[PDB]
Specification:
It is found in: Cell membrane; Membrane raft. This is part of a larger assembly, with one chain. Helix content is about 25%, strand content about 0%.
Amino acid sequence: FGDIQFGKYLRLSCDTDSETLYELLTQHWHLKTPNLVISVTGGAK
């Protein structure tokens, strides 16, 4: 758990279902979305 300061980070297992992650990130945290944009890059150092 815990905040990050120099945001909110979380270590979580891969085998969890996405519905309780959505319930975490929308109920305990900020609101819903009209849109969701994804970007793929990160193999480029």
